[PDB]
Amino acid sequence: MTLTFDHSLEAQWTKWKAMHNRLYGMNEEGWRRAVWEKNMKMIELHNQEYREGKHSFTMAMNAFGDMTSEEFRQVMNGFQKPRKGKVFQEPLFYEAPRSVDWREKGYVTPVKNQGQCGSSWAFSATGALEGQMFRKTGRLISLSEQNLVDCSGPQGNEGCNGGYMDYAFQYVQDNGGLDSEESYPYEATEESCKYNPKYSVANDTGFVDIPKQEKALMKAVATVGPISVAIDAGHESFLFYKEGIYFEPDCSSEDLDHAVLVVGYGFESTEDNNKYWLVKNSWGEEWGMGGYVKMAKDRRNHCGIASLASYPTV
């Protein structure tokens, strides 16, 4: 029987399923639609509250609309471990610009999509290494997350069950290279290692860990390039984020669960209320602002953005 559904959403539901290539099993469509309508109501309430001045950002339905919290746990996976990188050397007699955006200088590849695999650690790492290779050579090449997923087990990563950016940077050093995305395309599943040195386009000399301070993170973003970070993304407000400065009162500066890439920072209004980090995600361009999110900056390390920050040296 029809589990108390909103008749006015039927067409949208039919269209959403097609857009997202859903083909549901026996007796699956009903409870899935119920998940979707509950998320729709949650999004609409939040956005109405936004109209009433209660939030700094809006939400929108996306490809996560039918997912159970348990499936969402498959895509997340949390981050802790010794800090083994080289020491970040604070820039001396230096004030960083008021805004930075490395996309404007060619350091950033297009937004990618991790799919139904807990591999954001690999996307964060490739983004940071893409940035440094570009800094060093002036050439931007998208790098293979699949290469990291399949091959960096020895370094401590766990494929689609999670991993750490510094472990990925370590693998690249140990391995003597990393293949391009084109040569070693993304499958969103862990498979046997197929690294081929012929197709290596990147290398690293180790990595640098940034102190757990947003001021240090700002100096790093200003002087280095894109920075790998982990955040508490484990809230529906982030899952369905659409536009604006993300601020979630329940966000933890610990309990990190999702790796992303800081590509810059800025200030939406003047200069303590409305500063933001510009963050590249790996949930596709449909999510957020073309795949990006502005995360609250200088608000007591909101969502832990500065708690696990690093970059590779090339």
Side-chain angles (χ1 to χ4, degrees), residues 1-80 82-314:
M1 176 82 294
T2 165
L3 186 174
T4 67
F5 302 122
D6 184 338
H7 203 86
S8 86
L9 298 182
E10 196 160 86
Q12 181 164 2
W13 168 242
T14 301
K15 185 188 240 60
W16 181 91
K17 280 183 295 182
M19 268 192 288
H20 303 284
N21 295 307
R22 296 297 204 267
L23 296 173
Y24 289 135
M26 298 213 334
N27 296 21
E28 186 185 358
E29 210 223 77
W31 69 265
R32 286 281 189 197
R33 185 173 165 174
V35 175
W36 185 87
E37 289 198 355
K38 184 182 190 185
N39 279 326
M40 206 61 71
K41 290 195 179 186
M42 171 195 70
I43 293 158
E44 295 296 2
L45 176 55
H46 172 101
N47 288 335
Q48 181 56 44
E49 289 172 347
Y50 171 92
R51 290 176 193 105
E52 303 162 10
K54 301 185 202 182
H55 308 288
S56 51
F57 65 99
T58 51
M59 303 165 53
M61 173 63 66
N62 63 30
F64 305 142
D66 74 342
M67 290 184 64
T68 57
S69 293
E70 307 90 68
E71 294 165 342
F72 156 85
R73 261 66 145 285
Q74 121 173 78
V75 170
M76 245 73 174
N77 314 348
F79 297 69
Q80 291 191 345
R83 210 70 171 147
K84 291 182 67 271
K86 298 174 266 203
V87 179
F88 179 66
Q89 312 289 77
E90 297 282 354
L92 303 176
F93 298 158
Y94 175 86
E95 78 170 14
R98 303 170 51 72
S99 67
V100 170
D101 187 347
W102 289 113
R103 301 172 294 179
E104 296 179 347
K105 302 171 79 71
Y107 277 62
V108 187
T109 56
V111 165
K112 310 174 180 186
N113 194 337
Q114 68 189 84
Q116 293 307 315
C117 164
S119 53
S120 65
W121 58 270
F123 284 86
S124 180
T126 62
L129 200 204
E130 282 157 5
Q132 291 308 289
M133 293 300 302
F134 179 86
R135 180 200 59 64
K136 174 165 83 158
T137 67
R139 188 188 67 169
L140 186 65
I141 298 179
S142 180
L143 304 173
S144 167
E145 298 82 20
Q146 195 65 45
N147 191 163
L148 294 177
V149 164
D150 293 349
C151 303
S152 65
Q155 282 76 18
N157 289 325
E158 303 297 344
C160 291
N161 297 334
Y164 289 85
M165 295 78 75
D166 290 355
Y167 289 175
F169 301 146
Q170 187 60 59
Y171 162 80
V172 173
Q173 185 172 34
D174 298 339
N175 197 53
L178 184 72
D179 289 334
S180 69
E181 167 93 333
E182 278 210 272
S183 73
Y184 197 155
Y186 191 60
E187 311 172 43
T189 59
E190 187 183 337
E191 300 295 324
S192 67
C193 186
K194 294 171 208 63
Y195 172 72
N196 184 329
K198 165 173 178 166
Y199 300 126
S200 175
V201 291
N203 34 66
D204 73 30
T205 63
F207 57 91
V208 167
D209 290 326
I210 296 168
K212 312 344 289 139
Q213 305 291 329
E214 283 191 281
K215 172 180 172 67
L217 181 54
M218 176 173 50
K219 287 192 190 181
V221 173
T223 59
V224 172
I227 307 296
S228 294
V229 300
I231 57 172
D232 182 7
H235 299 95
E236 325 166 299
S237 55
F238 191 85
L239 199 58
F240 297 102
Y241 163 88
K242 181 59 170 209
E243 191 182 16
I245 297 184
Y246 184 73
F247 183 86
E248 165 56 71
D250 295 330
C251 235
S252 176
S253 306
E254 300 108 68
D255 315 9
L256 312 177
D257 62 12
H258 184 56
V260 292
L261 201 217
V262 178
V263 299
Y265 60 81
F267 55 92
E268 208 61 86
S269 326
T270 73
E271 210 85 347
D272 292 349
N273 307 9
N274 288 294
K275 291 187 286 185
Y276 61 83
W277 298 107
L278 186 65
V279 174
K280 187 189 190 196
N281 204 358
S282 55
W283 289 346
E285 302 190 332
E286 178 205 29
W287 181 88
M289 305 180 65
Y292 290 84
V293 52
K294 296 166 170 178
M295 296 184 67
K297 174 171 175 281
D298 301 325
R299 302 279 309 273
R300 289 215 227 256
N301 190 26
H302 191 64
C303 292
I305 184 114
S307 295
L308 200 69
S310 71
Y311 70 94
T313 52
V314 298

Coordinates of all heavy atoms in Angstrom, one line a residue, residues 12 16 39-40 42-44 46-47 57-65 236-243 286-288:
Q12 N 7.8 14.7 -9.3 CA 9.2 15.0 -8.9 C 9.9 13.8 -8.5 O 11.1 13.6 -8.8 CB 9.2 16.1 -7.8 CG 10.6 16.4 -7.3 CD 10.7 17.7 -6.5 OE1 9.7 18.3 -6.2 NE2 11.9 18.1 -6.2
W16 N 13.1 12.2 -10.2 CA 14.3 12.1 -9.4 C 14.9 10.8 -9.6 O 16.2 10.6 -9.8 CB 14.0 12.4 -7.9 CG 15.2 12.4 -7.1 CD1 16.0 13.4 -6.7 CD2 15.7 11.2 -6.4 NE1 17.0 13.0 -5.9 CE2 16.9 11.6 -5.7 CE3 15.4 9.8 -6.4 CZ2 17.7 10.7 -5.0 CZ3 16.1 9.0 -5.6 CH2 17.3 9.4 -4.9
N39 N 13.3 13.7 3.6 CA 14.4 14.6 3.3 C 13.9 15.9 2.7 O 14.3 17.0 3.0 CB 15.4 13.9 2.5 CG 16.4 13.1 3.3 OD1 16.7 13.4 4.4 ND2 16.8 12.0 2.7
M40 N 12.9 15.7 1.7 CA 12.3 16.9 1.1 C 11.7 17.9 2.2 O 12.0 19.1 2.1 CB 11.2 16.5 0.1 CG 11.0 17.5 -1.0 SD 12.5 17.8 -2.0 CE 12.5 16.3 -2.8
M42 N 12.5 18.1 5.3 CA 13.6 18.6 6.1 C 14.3 19.8 5.4 O 14.6 20.8 5.9 CB 14.6 17.5 6.4 CG 15.9 17.9 7.0 SD 17.1 16.6 6.9 CE 17.4 16.5 5.2
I43 N 14.5 19.6 4.1 CA 15.1 20.6 3.2 C 14.2 21.9 3.2 O 14.6 23.0 3.4 CB 15.4 20.1 1.8 CG1 16.5 19.1 1.9 CG2 15.7 21.2 0.9 CD1 16.6 18.1 0.8
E44 N 12.9 21.7 3.0 CA 11.9 22.8 2.8 C 11.8 23.5 4.1 O 11.7 24.7 4.1 CB 10.6 22.3 2.4 CG 10.5 21.7 0.9 CD 10.9 22.7 -0.2 OE1 11.2 23.9 0.2 OE2 10.9 22.4 -1.3
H46 N 14.2 23.7 6.5 CA 15.4 24.5 6.7 C 15.3 25.8 5.8 O 15.7 26.9 6.3 CB 16.6 23.7 6.3 CG 17.9 24.5 6.3 ND1 18.8 24.4 7.3 CD2 18.4 25.3 5.4 CE1 19.8 25.2 7.0 NE2 19.6 25.8 5.9
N47 N 15.0 25.6 4.6 CA 15.0 26.8 3.7 C 14.0 27.8 4.1 O 14.2 29.0 3.9 CB 14.8 26.3 2.3 CG 16.0 25.6 1.7 OD1 17.1 25.8 2.2 ND2 15.8 24.7 0.8
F57 N 22.8 29.5 5.2 CA 22.9 28.7 4.0 C 21.6 28.0 3.7 O 20.8 27.9 4.6 CB 24.0 27.7 4.1 CG 23.7 26.6 5.1 CD1 23.2 25.4 4.7 CD2 24.0 26.9 6.4 CE1 23.0 24.4 5.7 CE2 23.8 25.9 7.4 CZ 23.2 24.7 7.0
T58 N 21.4 27.6 2.4 CA 20.3 26.9 2.0 C 20.7 25.4 1.7 O 21.9 25.1 1.5 CB 19.7 27.5 0.7 OG1 20.7 27.7 -0.3 CG2 18.9 28.8 1.0
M59 N 19.7 24.6 1.5 CA 19.8 23.2 1.2 C 19.0 22.9 -0.1 O 18.2 23.7 -0.5 CB 19.4 22.3 2.4 CG 20.2 22.5 3.6 SD 19.4 21.8 5.1 CE 19.3 20.1 4.6
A60 N 19.3 21.7 -0.7 CA 18.6 21.3 -1.9 C 18.7 19.8 -2.0 O 19.7 19.2 -1.6 CB 19.2 21.9 -3.2
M61 N 17.6 19.2 -2.6 CA 17.6 17.8 -2.8 C 18.7 17.5 -3.9 O 19.0 18.3 -4.7 CB 16.2 17.4 -3.3 CG 16.2 15.9 -3.8 SD 16.5 14.7 -2.6 CE 15.1 14.9 -1.5
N62 N 19.3 16.3 -3.7 CA 20.4 15.9 -4.6 C 20.4 14.3 -4.6 O 19.4 13.7 -4.3 CB 21.7 16.5 -4.0 CG 22.1 16.0 -2.7 OD1 21.7 14.9 -2.3 ND2 22.8 16.9 -1.9
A63 N 21.5 13.8 -5.1 CA 21.5 12.3 -5.3 C 21.5 11.5 -4.0 O 21.4 10.3 -4.1 CB 22.8 12.0 -6.1
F64 N 21.7 12.1 -2.8 CA 21.6 11.5 -1.6 C 20.2 11.4 -1.0 O 20.0 10.8 0.1 CB 22.5 12.2 -0.5 CG 23.9 12.4 -1.0 CD1 24.6 13.6 -0.7 CD2 24.6 11.4 -1.7 CE1 25.9 13.8 -1.1 CE2 25.9 11.6 -2.1 CZ 26.5 12.8 -1.8
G65 N 19.2 11.8 -1.7 CA 17.8 12.0 -1.2 C 17.2 10.7 -0.7 O 16.3 10.8 0.2
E236 N 22.9 16.2 8.1 CA 22.1 16.3 6.9 C 22.2 17.7 6.3 O 22.0 17.8 5.1 CB 20.6 16.0 7.2 CG 20.3 14.9 8.3 CD 18.9 14.9 8.8 OE1 18.5 16.0 9.4 OE2 18.2 13.9 8.7
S237 N 22.4 18.7 7.1 CA 22.6 20.1 6.6 C 23.7 20.2 5.6 O 23.7 21.0 4.7 CB 22.8 21.0 7.8 OG 23.9 20.6 8.5
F238 N 24.8 19.4 5.8 CA 25.9 19.4 4.9 C 25.6 18.4 3.7 O 25.9 18.8 2.6 CB 27.2 18.9 5.6 CG 28.5 19.1 4.8 CD1 29.1 20.3 4.8 CD2 28.9 18.1 4.0 CE1 30.3 20.5 4.0 CE2 30.1 18.2 3.3 CZ 30.7 19.4 3.3
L239 N 25.0 17.3 4.0 CA 24.7 16.3 2.9 C 23.9 17.0 1.8 O 24.1 16.8 0.6 CB 23.9 15.1 3.5 CG 23.9 13.9 2.6 CD1 25.3 13.4 2.4 CD2 23.1 12.7 3.3
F240 N 22.9 17.9 2.2 CA 22.1 18.6 1.2 C 22.4 20.0 1.1 O 21.6 20.8 0.6 CB 20.6 18.3 1.6 CG 20.2 16.9 1.6 CD1 20.1 16.1 2.7 CD2 20.0 16.3 0.3 CE1 19.8 14.8 2.7 CE2 19.7 14.9 0.3 CZ 19.6 14.2 1.5
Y241 N 23.6 20.4 1.4 CA 24.0 21.8 1.3 C 23.9 22.3 -0.1 O 24.2 21.5 -1.1 CB 25.4 22.0 1.8 CG 26.1 23.3 1.3 CD1 26.0 24.5 2.1 CD2 26.9 23.3 0.2 CE1 26.6 25.6 1.7 CE2 27.5 24.5 -0.2 CZ 27.3 25.6 0.5 OH 28.0 26.8 0.1
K242 N 23.4 23.5 -0.3 CA 23.2 24.1 -1.6 C 24.1 25.4 -1.9 O 24.8 25.5 -2.9 CB 21.8 24.3 -2.0 CG 21.6 24.9 -3.4 CD 22.2 24.0 -4.5 CE 21.8 24.5 -5.9 NZ 21.8 23.4 -6.9
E243 N 23.9 26.4 -1.0 CA 24.6 27.7 -1.2 C 24.7 28.4 0.1 O 23.9 28.3 1.0 CB 23.8 28.5 -2.3 CG 24.5 29.7 -2.8 CD 23.7 30.5 -3.8 OE1 22.5 30.3 -3.8 OE2 24.3 31.3 -4.5
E286 N 26.7 18.6 -8.9 CA 25.3 18.8 -8.5 C 25.2 19.3 -7.1 O 24.3 20.0 -6.7 CB 24.5 17.6 -8.8 CG 23.0 17.7 -8.3 CD 22.4 16.3 -8.0 OE1 23.1 15.4 -7.5 OE2 21.1 16.2 -8.1
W287 N 26.2 18.9 -6.3 CA 26.1 19.2 -4.8 C 26.7 20.6 -4.6 O 27.6 21.1 -5.3 CB 27.0 18.2 -4.1 CG 27.0 18.4 -2.6 CD1 26.1 17.9 -1.7 CD2 27.9 19.2 -1.8 NE1 26.4 18.3 -0.4 CE2 27.5 19.1 -0.5 CE3 29.0 19.9 -2.2 CZ2 28.3 19.8 0.5 CZ3 29.7 20.6 -1.2 CH2 29.4 20.5 0.1
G288 N 26.1 21.3 -3.6 CA 26.6 22.6 -3.2 C 26.7 23.5 -4.4 O 25.8 23.6 -5.3

